[PDB]
Amino acid sequence: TPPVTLEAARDNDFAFDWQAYTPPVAHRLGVQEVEASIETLRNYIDWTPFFMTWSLAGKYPRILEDEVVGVEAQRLFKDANDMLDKLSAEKTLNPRGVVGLFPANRVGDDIEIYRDETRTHVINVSHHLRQQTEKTGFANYCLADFVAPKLSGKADYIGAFAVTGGLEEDALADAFEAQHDDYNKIMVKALADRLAEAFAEYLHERVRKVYWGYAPNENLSNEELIRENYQGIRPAPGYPACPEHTEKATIWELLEVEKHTGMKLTESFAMWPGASVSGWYFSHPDSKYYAVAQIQRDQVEDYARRKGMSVTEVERWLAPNLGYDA
Ligand SMILES: Nc1ncnc2c1ncn2[C@@H]1O[C@H](C[C@@H](N)CC[C@H](N)C(=O)O)[C@@H](O)[C@H]1O
């Protein structure tokens, strides 16, 4: 669909009656280091992407009884769970994370994150982009729209997290590599990835039920979790609703991620360990995933100003989303 101006997109923001709504208050404000054992996380694994990593099609568990790939899938599953058993018993891969909840309000396309409930001093701003093509029957979405506008005077909140399958991932993979054991190098990396993603799923449930606490009686099966049958989202920088990777630096500062977990950011703002997930938490019932997609020069320049960056800098970080030749 054809581009619209930045002002036209903002005039089509998510429509919601904030005066009639009470955002749920975060029960546990502040930052908390967390850990999770392999025994705990293995009940939150989504196995279907594991089999995709091994080039097998089909959803788990039905893939195990498949007529052509089932026997191979069963052997992969057995080797995977034997390796989880060993990693668990030997404590050689140790998932870690950190979670935080903060007072927050929307201003424009950004989310102000406050030091405290006086909502004066801003400790960080979470910057977001807005869809910028002609939308029929939908808002031009921006993740900031899911937090109450500061002008509404409603007390709202935002969360953030960072989790990893464990800092030991490289040492375990590198040992298999030195042995020319490609199978087990792929296996331990695929397991660390499942453990990181399982930790993201588990911690999000902890946030909905307890840390934020807006869904204390939620009782979903793992299959229902995989289907996202809960209220709220956990969008991650680099994914289509928030594609701009340098916002991971804001999460790293907000949560003191490196101090609490050992996890690091590269110059490309990739996470280390490789098996890592970081992102935000939104509680709003209408919050959903979508793609920002292609944006125009006016929004690039505005984003640069808000970020304290030059236009040239931002055109690097936003290159995949530029709707024009830079
Ligand atoms: N459009 C989007 N914008 C932002 N984050 C997204 C988007 N789509 C997916 N995500 C993120 O990706 C997650 C979904 C999956 N990657 C992870 C769970 C899945 N069961 C798996 O193991 O692959 C979401 O919970 C978000 O953190």
Swiss-Prot record:
Keywords: Amino-acid biosynthesis, Cobalamin, Cobalt, Metal-binding, Methionine biosynthesis, Methyltransferase, Repeat, S-adenosyl-L-methionine, Transferase, Zinc. One of its GO terms (molecular function) is cobalamin binding. GO terms for cellular component: cytoplasm; cytosol. Residues 1-326 form the AdoMet activation domain. It comes from the Bacteria. GO terms for biological process: homocysteine metabolic process; methionine biosynthetic process; methylation; tetrahydrofolate interconversion; tetrahydrofolate metabolic process. Transmembrane segments: none annotated. The keyword Nucleotide-binding does not apply. S-adenosyl-L-methionine binds at D46, R234, Y289, Y290. The keyword Flavoprotein does not apply. Belongs to the vitamin-B12 dependent methionine synthase family. Modular enzyme with four functionally distinct domains. The isolated Hcy-binding domain catalyzes methyl transfer from free methylcobalamin to homocysteine. The Hcy-binding domain in association with the pterin-binding domain catalyzes the methylation of cob(I)alamin by methyltetrahydrofolate and the methylation of homocysteine. The B12-binding domain binds the cofactor. The AdoMet activation domain binds S-adenosyl-L-methionine. Under aerobic conditions cob(I)alamin can be converted to inactive cob(II)alamin. Catalyzes the transfer of a methyl group from methyl-cobalamin to homocysteine, yielding enzyme-bound cob(I)alamin and methionine. Subsequently, remethylates the cofactor using methyltetrahydrofolate. L-homocysteine is bound via the zinc atom. This is Methionine synthase. It comes from Escherichia coli (strain K12). The gene is metH. The chain holds residues 901 to 1226 of 1227 of the full protein.
